[PDB]
Amino acid sequence: FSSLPSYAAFATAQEAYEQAVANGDSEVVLKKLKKSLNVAKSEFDRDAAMQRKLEKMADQAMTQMYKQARSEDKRAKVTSAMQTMLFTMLRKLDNDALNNIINNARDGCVPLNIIPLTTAAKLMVVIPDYNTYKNTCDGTTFTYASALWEIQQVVDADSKIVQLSEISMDNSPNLAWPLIVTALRA
């Protein structure tokens, strides 16, 4: 608290007192130099008091104001923050089965139900084209989630059953493309 007029007044009072002490003038004369000095801080220790309270008061209000802003906007972007955090954790996990499925989902292949873990239950996987069929389906076997699934059914989009060997490179542009492959776990 240096940039206040009372600081200048206190400095003048202290200079006068220092001169009186170094001079040793009288006993009432220097008393007048402290009858008007300790009061000069009585209006200096106070006008530097409520403003000193105010600086930290503005601080300890504006800080919770920031905290309110962060609280109110943090809960407004949860739907994206959680999913980004999920995918970062997924990619950090580094598991072959999950990576295979996430790549299949990103390009062409998503299932139609929960993938079962028993060696008896059924799975339906959509294949959008023949390129993904090349990578995934090789004959009667279907590789998916680091597992083998025997093919027993594949149907085009308009619900017409199509046999296995019918599909190849050049006769492929003759079927409804979002194919649904039914398979059973090995």
Partner: protein
């Protein structure tokens, strides 16, 4: 009169170690008011009294837990520790013992009310807490019995229940003894007079109940909080069948609570210098501080780590906005420092460092985002262990 009420059933949302959907009871306001005006003065005396068997209302901080343990060890001749846990305390308590608990709480009204007033208060209690109607999923069902956790007097009623089960276990044990092999003439006279007072006396005998209470207080010392209990007992009397062991207690629960207790819910301890194995999910370590040995409570570090890793609200995922959560966690996990294993103290050091890290992050964000500083000097104490050493040190 009688005023039937409806208590709502609520699905709790909190962390737990087993996939069980624990629920709670939102009891209505009439019961809350007209039970408050009665058990408020009944119970504020209990909650503020130190050195009694009921320990509720006393903090473990500032050496409280050590005082509790010393009280439990009050002049036990051959001391051993024993603990139990009822399988389903709240949903299997038979109706009679609930009535008994309400009655022994209402006993303190020998002056302020007439007998009919006492009877009608008890009637309202059993009408809105014992066999009332509960609304579960927009439908009304009748509660066959049990107790409704959510009233004003659940913990103390369970304390009364625990005391009753312990004492009846002791009596059943002592009257199951042969009585000819028993060596102490005083104890044999005690047995004979106890039988006479039970099955041959139509009135109360103050003298004998005082003597028997003195007997148990001398040889069978309990410390009770809700449904959890810690007892110090004489080995010789237990071996000779003079006081209740785990077997008698199990038998008593079997024939008077319609439930079988297993060993996973009960523990024994032959070394009293280790403290009880578990109490309110708090373990005990005997350690050294200030030229004195005291017992300090330490929790499961798994619980503390789970609290750190997972939270309740989405805003709770940011440590910066809320540092005091880590502060209180640090007080609670501080006694892990004295544990011989390194990882338990390592959890506490982790928390101290991460509190410091979040304070630094908060300062950085605020200064970059608002070019003013308020980091102060008191905050530095939050990552210093003395703040946590004084919390458990007995001067407050």
């Amino acid at each position: 009169n009688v005023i039937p009420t409806i208590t709502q059933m609520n699905l709790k949302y909190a962390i737990s170690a087993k996939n069980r959907a624990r629920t709670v009871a939102g009891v209505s306001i009439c019961s809350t008011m007209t039970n408050r005006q009665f058990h408020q003065k009944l119970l504020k005396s209990i909650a503020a009294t130190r050195g009694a068997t009921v320990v509720i209302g006393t903090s473990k901080f500032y050496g409280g837990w050590h005082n509790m343990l010393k009280t439990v060890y009050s002049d036990v001749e051959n001391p051993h520790l024993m603990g139990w846990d009822y399988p389903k305390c709240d949903r299997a308590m038979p109706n009679m013992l609930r009535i008994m608990a309400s009655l022994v709480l209402a006993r303190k009204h020998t002056t302020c009310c007439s007998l009919s007033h006492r009877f009608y208060r008890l009637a309202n209690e059993c009408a809105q807490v014992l066999s009332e109607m509960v609304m579960c999923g927009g439908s009304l069902y009748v509660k066959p019995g049990g107790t409704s956790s959510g009233d004003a007097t659940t913990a103390y009623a369970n304390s009364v229940f625990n005391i009753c089960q312990a004492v009846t276990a002791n009596v059943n044990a002592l009257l199951s003894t042969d009585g000819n092999k028993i060596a102490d003439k005083y104890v044999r006279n005690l047995q004979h007079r106890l039988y006479e007072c039970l099955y041959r006396n139509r009135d109360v005998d103050t003298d004998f109940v005082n003597e028997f209470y003195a007997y148990l207080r001398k040889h069978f010392s309990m410390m009770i909080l809700s449904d959890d209990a810690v007892v110090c007992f004489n080995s010789t009397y237990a071996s000779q069948g003079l006081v209740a062991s785990i077997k008698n207690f199990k038998s008593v629960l079997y024939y008077q609570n319609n439930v079988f207790m297993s060993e996973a819910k009960c523990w024994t301890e032959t070394d009293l210098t280790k403290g009880p194995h578990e109490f309110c999910s708090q373990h005990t370590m005997l350690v050294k501080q200030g030229d004195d040995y005291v017992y300090l409570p330490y929790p499961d570090p798994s619980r503390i780590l789970g609290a750190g890793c997972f939270v309740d609200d989405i805003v709770k995922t940011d440590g910066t906005l809320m540092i005091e959560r880590f502060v209180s966690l640090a007080i609670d996990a501080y006694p892990l420092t004295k544990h011989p294993n390194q990882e338990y103290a390592d959890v506490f050091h982790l928390y101290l460092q991460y509190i410091r890290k979040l304070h630094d992050e908060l300062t950085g964000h605020m200064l970059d985002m608002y070019s003013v500083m308020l980091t102060n000097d008191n905050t530095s104490r939050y990552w210093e262990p003395e703040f946590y050493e004084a919390m458990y040190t007995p001067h407050t």
